[PDB]
Design a protein around this ligand. Sequence first.
Ligand SMILES: Nc1ncnc2c1ncn2[C@@H]1O[C@H](COP(=O)(O)OP(=O)(O)O)[C@@H](O)[C@H]1O
Ligand SMILES: Nc1ncnc2c1ncn2[C@@H]1O[C@H](COP(=O)(O)OP(=O)(O)O)[C@@H](O)[C@H]1O
Ligand SMILES: Nc1ncnc2c1ncn2[C@@H]1O[C@H](COP(=O)(O)OP(=O)(O)O)[C@@H](O)[C@H]1O
Ligand SMILES: Nc1ncnc2c1ncn2[C@@H]1O[C@H](COP(=O)(O)OP(=O)(O)O)[C@@H](O)[C@H]1O
Lengths: 77, 77, 441, 437, 438, 459
Amino acid sequence: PRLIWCDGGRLDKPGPGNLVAGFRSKYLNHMMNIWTPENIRSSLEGIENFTWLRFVDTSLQEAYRASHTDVFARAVD
Amino acid sequence: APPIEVVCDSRSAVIERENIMFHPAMRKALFGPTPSEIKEASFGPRPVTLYPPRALLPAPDHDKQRFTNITVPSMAR
Amino acid sequence: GLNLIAAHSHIRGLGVDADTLEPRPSSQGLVGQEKARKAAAVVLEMIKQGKIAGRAVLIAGPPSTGKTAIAMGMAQSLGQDVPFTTLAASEIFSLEMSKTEALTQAFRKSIGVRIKEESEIMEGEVVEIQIDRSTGGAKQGKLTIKTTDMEAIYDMGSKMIDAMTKERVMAGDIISIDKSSGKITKLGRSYARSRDYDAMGVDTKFLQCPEGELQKRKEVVHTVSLHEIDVINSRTQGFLALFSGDTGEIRSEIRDQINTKVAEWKEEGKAEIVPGVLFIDEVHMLDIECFSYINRALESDLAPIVIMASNRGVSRIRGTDYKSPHGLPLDFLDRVVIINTHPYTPDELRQILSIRAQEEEVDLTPDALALLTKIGQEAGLRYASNLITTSQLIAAKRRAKQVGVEDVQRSFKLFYDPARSVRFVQESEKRLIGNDGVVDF
Amino acid sequence: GLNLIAAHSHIRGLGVDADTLEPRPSSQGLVGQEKARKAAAVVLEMIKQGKIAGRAVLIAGPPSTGKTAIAMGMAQSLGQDVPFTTLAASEIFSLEMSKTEALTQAFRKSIGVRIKEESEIMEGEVVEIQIDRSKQGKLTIKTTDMEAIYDMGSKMIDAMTKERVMAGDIISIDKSSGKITKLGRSYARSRDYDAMGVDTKFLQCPEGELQKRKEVVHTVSLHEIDVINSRTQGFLALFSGDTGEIRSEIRDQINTKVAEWKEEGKAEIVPGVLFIDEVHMLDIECFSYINRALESDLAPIVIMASNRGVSRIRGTDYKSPHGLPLDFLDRVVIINTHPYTPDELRQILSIRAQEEEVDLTPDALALLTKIGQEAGLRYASNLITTSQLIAAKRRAKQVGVEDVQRSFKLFYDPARSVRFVQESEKRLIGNDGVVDF
Amino acid sequence: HRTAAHTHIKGLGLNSSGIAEKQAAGFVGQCAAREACGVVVDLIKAHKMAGRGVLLAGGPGTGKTALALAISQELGTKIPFCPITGSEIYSTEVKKTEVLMENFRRAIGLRVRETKDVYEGEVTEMTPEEASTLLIGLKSARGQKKLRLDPSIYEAIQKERVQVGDVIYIETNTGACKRVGRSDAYATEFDLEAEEYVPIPKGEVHKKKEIVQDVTLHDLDVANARPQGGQDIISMMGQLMKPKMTEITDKLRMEINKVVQKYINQGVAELIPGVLFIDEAHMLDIECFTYLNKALESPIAPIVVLASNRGIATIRGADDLKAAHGIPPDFLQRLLIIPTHPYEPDEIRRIVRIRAQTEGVQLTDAAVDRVAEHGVRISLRYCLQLLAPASILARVNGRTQVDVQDIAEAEELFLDARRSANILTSTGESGGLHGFIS
Amino acid sequence: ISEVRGNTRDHRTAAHTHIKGLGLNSSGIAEKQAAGFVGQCAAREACGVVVDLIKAHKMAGRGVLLAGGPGTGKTALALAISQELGTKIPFCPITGSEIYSTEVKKTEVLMENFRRAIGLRVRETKDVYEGEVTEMTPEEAENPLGGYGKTISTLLIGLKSARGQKKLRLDPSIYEAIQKERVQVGDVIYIETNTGACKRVGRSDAYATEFDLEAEEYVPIPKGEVHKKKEIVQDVTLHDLDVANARPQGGQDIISMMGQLMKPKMTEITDKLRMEINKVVQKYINQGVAELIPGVLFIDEAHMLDIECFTYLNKALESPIAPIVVLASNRGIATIRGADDLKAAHGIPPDFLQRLLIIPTHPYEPDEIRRIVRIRAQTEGVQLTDAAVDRVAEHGVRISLRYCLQLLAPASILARVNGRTQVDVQDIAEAEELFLDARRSANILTSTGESGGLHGFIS
Ligand SMILES: Nc1ncnc2c1ncn2[C@@H]1O[C@H](COP(=O)(O)OP(=O)(O)O)[C@@H](O)[C@H]1O
Ligand SMILES: Nc1ncnc2c1ncn2[C@@H]1O[C@H](COP(=O)(O)OP(=O)(O)O)[C@@H](O)[C@H]1O
Ligand SMILES: Nc1ncnc2c1ncn2[C@@H]1O[C@H](COP(=O)(O)OP(=O)(O)O)[C@@H](O)[C@H]1O
Ligand SMILES: Nc1ncnc2c1ncn2[C@@H]1O[C@H](COP(=O)(O)OP(=O)(O)O)[C@@H](O)[C@H]1O
């Protein structure tokens, strides 16, 4: 039906009725994420978790694009 | 067979089908650049990049019959 | 055409009365069993009520006493409304996923959601199509159609002309333009333009024009289970998984959120929950790791009623080593409620053989039916029900019409009943491989 | 704030004298286990020296005596410099990697590589992109204090184009590599738009000088270097877990290059501590690898705990002391522990009281000491919270004899639960049959 | 409103002074266990808990899980409650010491408040201002309104096929957009276009509502490990590229604790520690009571209510030791063990009355005594499963209330386990053609 | 960037640090107290014969067993052989509990370790033009083609190394490199000889300040030659050839750019591939280019291999290209792990045991433990008096060998904490009660640990 496939049966389509799917998308993919460059820049200076990021041939933008695309789009990159 | 699709009678279902099951970004990334894009990239004053930098389709490993199942009666037979 | 006569193609329902719940002794195929069919009638009438949880009814009984028969009667006496799901209990031991989760999906497959919403469709024969592709493109065009009553002209958008050259709508097709999406399902071909079709077969069906108005609203009713929604909301395009079994361990937060949105759909009146039936055939083939999950999946609001069938007596439980009645642990036998069956009296054997003979349309003399009842007293229903199909063919060897004693006595001569096969094994020990020895004459 | 009072919260280091190694009794949380704490202090002093490679120290003893307490004391009294690894033994039995490799990675985590360098980074807020379509350009960046105009030639204009940097972003350039990392937008341009996108996060302006150079001390492990060199974009594998049987030739190249870095003075190797909690869960197929991985130069000083007496070894069918094979017990050294006197039990319950900010009358403390002597530590420590909560229900400040007796009446110690089971056998599912009354 | 096995459980039914009262809130009797579970509920709400274990003894038929659902409805919808059986810990994609930590991270809750500013309405114009920022007029049935868009939300509008007069639904905060349909004023532009013609919304254009909404930390773990749902389009292959559960390392959890503590220190989110109810803990084997003895000692661990009904049994996975409850005494000293005693014959009748007035099945007092007779002499789970079939034998025979005759018929139509065992042994004597196959 | 620390470049003490070789004569007769060993004469003579067999290239699939009890020196002889052979001959010290994988069958990790144990030395040449580009100046042809514009016959490149610069005339079909790779003035390149297609390494360091922000890698000038005609020895194990032929490393498509992007999975290798690689390596040896060098596969703890592995080892040892298999077994009459039927010697099946040259290993005399203590003490640097040596030897004879070599580190720590420099009898008599052996631990475990109760162990 058009309820499940379009309106609010999908947990990813952020239509009205699926009021969770906007909030959950933003606060799991851009605010409370450990790969956003703001949440990397504060943890790069010693024993902490992104210590190694200075030495692998990447940058913050390399890591941030690499942690949200697919295996496909990362292969195209 | 073609893959199974969803018969849902909204416009959004048709748009999501033609954006997932076809998804022109992957098709452009797989087959290569438009010849118009080749012309605007090869007559310009400065070198510019291409988003499929070459045709990313893999070379088929069987010369006479590639990526199909169609059979022509072979000339010897 | 895919209606080949099986071992249960004669059961057309449970056969009991629906007013005083009396098991009338011969109706709709199920003949003879009385007390068990009344208890199955009570269970069936509390399934369609809906105001009960997932409970457990165990159809225990000896082999070939009509347990799959009662389950198939309850399956036929519900129609395609309340979801009945068969589960032979060896489909659970998979390798694509774990075992408890494979059981959870079989619980989720039997809780339907039934929603009813409308569409707008168009019947009718196409009189003619004109498309203004002149270098032009799909920009404007005229569509003239008709029913027996109506006749109309419509103008078309660009994303409709691209669906008209997509389905290649001729002058004479019987199409169904679903207006809300744009798909075109050609119901057939009109008879009156039979000359106008050259690229068709010599044998081609032709319809008549549709009758009635040309623009009508349909109230279609869909019913999908919770496992359907779970597999849909699991990947990018994930419904293919439930057609290919490639679904894996579905995370439990998805099932929790769908259990929340189904309740929010019910409270808004947009939906309706239909509890189905799950038939776990041969429930003794589960280890205790299964029963320690069925004891708690039969607790929630969303749980289908489980009907299950056991053959074994005092037997061992798989996984463990200690024996138990019916092959089930005692803390799980506290949950279930047991219906016991009985072996069949010989007149009931005779009329069951009569129903199985009338189902395959095989003529029998009454002497051959008496001999066949005498065989079925000593070798069970399955042996005689196969001797029927053998004896029809043996009568068809020598070009006869009705089977007789001279063909049942040949079918009893060639194909051994299993008692004489056990006697054959016991009297041919030294050549049949028992465990160690092979002797060659 | 994601930090709640657990069982191991009052132990702030090992609590011994650092000069002459004298375990004074009530120091840094730990109470009265003087010989084992002295031995752990000797172990810790040969850990921080870091010369002697690949010992093995087993901590035997009865349950509820303090074997993980001394381990957490050794973990707290090292600092963030020397690594430490809390691995219970059931973590090894995986379904994606075998037992040998998932126990090799436990050794590869506990050896750090320490390297000090200078980071030449540039924070800044973009003011105006000035592209001269003649190749050249000018970038104007500001902070809360300064503002400057830097030239650009050919290609980082194209990097700006690929990054789509608008006026108001917070860009960061690592000038030793040269790649733009857009950090987001500023709060001074939140008033500008009304319907924001998804990707935009707001930040404060950068503060201070543009060109920031700072000497930072990086400390990675060998396991980091092993997993990064596994596959191409393999750095996210150590967060995800999507790695498997790494080949031996990669680990050989990595150990050779770490030896080469130690020769050239770039790197300093810091050996650490692997802590294998509850080592009796390992089968013989794991001890046959531990007996070889304690031979190389790159092996951490392994500290392991155990509970069991003469028990069977998993994987085989013969009894052994401590659940360990004897060819492994010829290799380790063993520090035994001892049960506690009531004089130690009283002040351990006092420390658990002052950790949970629960006030106790002395009569309640004596009663709780008797309960701890008759039932153990883990039941006595679980009655402070319950007596505090029952005192909170009847609105009393100090807990008393009545609340502790109420908590003893409600919840059962494990000494009486066995008599409760053996008292009513006909209803508990023993092995075969249930009565169900 | 459909009846389950624990519909009549509403709460623990306590006093103000924490003393249980008999026949309160659905329970009948069972005083000390309800008092202890009330103390447990107060411990969960007190937020001074970083891993506590509570075991529930008592055989089958007694009310162990009724206490757990009483706790779950006593906490409310706010504090998370995760019930899992023991047998769910086994998988074929991850180790079984990782599904335990996945349940611990489903237990802890993180509540965030949001003020969602939604925009329903018909697009009036699509005007690119700068050469970038693109104004959109959203016409409602109450009035149009200008709206300035970021140059990244416009590339989410543009991926959707919004052209001139499509009604849209823009989230202002999260930047989420959906094309609802084409407005019915532009309906009959052509005559067989294919869109979903919907009317213009007869409300505001700017609806401002606030939503409190929860996130479990396991969802943070999954959303930070692998890309999920939105842009994960290669998962439609299925074989190797599906979202398979992966071994979430300790480093990822140790960083997600840092980020969540950062967003708690800004006063954005709130933290709520949950409850993990592991039922039938004998199915947990010794390769998980080793890992629980470590994982409960974290300063972040939630409370664990274990339930176990067995006596002195064999611990699974290590066949050469027996222990009480199927729990190793290495782990059993941690637990607070609560007893659960059986039921007296005068405390079964009240359960029959409450279970009868839960299902709506009314019956005379001469039948309550018979159901209590079957409750004493056979079992408690069986006598409660005759109230629902006998009502079906009541309204069919022209009655409304259940008498003795309907239950005397249902005891013959619906045999229990004991009489079925007697028929299975004694009546099914010889193993032959018409006998059971042991 | 990275700041160099000027500290002491010492090393760490392992359990086999003091071993430096076998310590033989020029005739093969062993000599006691030489190169780390103490005693153990016949085993060192037999291992010297094994070392001679390996360096003589006559071993083609032999097998050597090391018997003897635990803590007697089998792994010591293994590391002695590995340090005696050197570094240019391979040595792959796997264990028995390292063939069990979850991606491949366990009779395949054995074959991959055989291929790790075999080396191949290849001697070749390297002819490259090298350095930073100074000019890219074309030259007009003598006869231009009619119908076109420019016609360029020879392209000139000025390459400047860090020692000397050089002008270079090239064929004009270097242009397709230069346009595709974007080579400009100030970019170090290398031009090969077999094809001749230059590939840019990076912008030079002298032009690191012409701009300000536009940065990439700034590689320095190649501090070497401008025309390398340098020869290369190159060691590749046959495992590396099997992997590079089975799973190709660098491709240009989507799916091989997902294969190196997804995790590399060990896959089983079909035997036709190994047969072909052997047939071609034995051809390149006959041409006289590559040298085959067999190594040692020291399978430590050989009683962990079950009966399904020795069956594959019989096939693998009958191959014409195979290294030596030095097993290491320390069991007597043991049950073989696979088939729980036959109690065989050493955990080795009696069919496989006939292939093996069994070398014994004897226990140590009670006057050689003190010599091992002296060598281990002067290895760590821990010096100690003679009565302390006699007490450690007393603990070594009466308890264990591995236990008297572990009372040296806590004694040294307590010595330099108490305020001394050398270890006396008091420090060892104090450290003997902080670190109990297995014997007194089992005594406490049985005597004090009576039964499972409150203050008791869990049996
Ligand atoms: N009441 C009945 N009416 C008609 N056929 C029956 C009846 N009971 C049993 N049968 C027949 O007997 C056969 C055995 O029944 P079934 O339930 O399959 O045995 P089992 O319980 O061993 O599976 C079935 O093929 C069915 O056709
Ligand atoms: N010396 C001590 N002083 C204070 N508290 C202690 C001491 N020893 C043990 N404890 C406490 O007793 C508890 C049990 O110690 P633990 O090592 O967990 O026992 P087990 O070795 O049985 O696991 C720990 O929570 C610890 O806080
Ligand atoms: N105090 C009580 N009041 C009412 N019903 C109860 C009570 N205790 C138990 N029950 C009943 O017991 C049943 C649940 O038994 P359960 O606790 O699941 O046993 P177990 O935990 O051993 O599986 C429920 O049907 C519930 O009606
Ligand atoms: N001949 C020897 N000379 C010096 N040290 C020895 C000798 N033999 C054995 N050792 C020492 O004994 C210790 C244990 O011997 P080990 O090699 O572990 O026996 P196994 O080979 O049976 O495992 C090693 O650390 C080694 O240093």
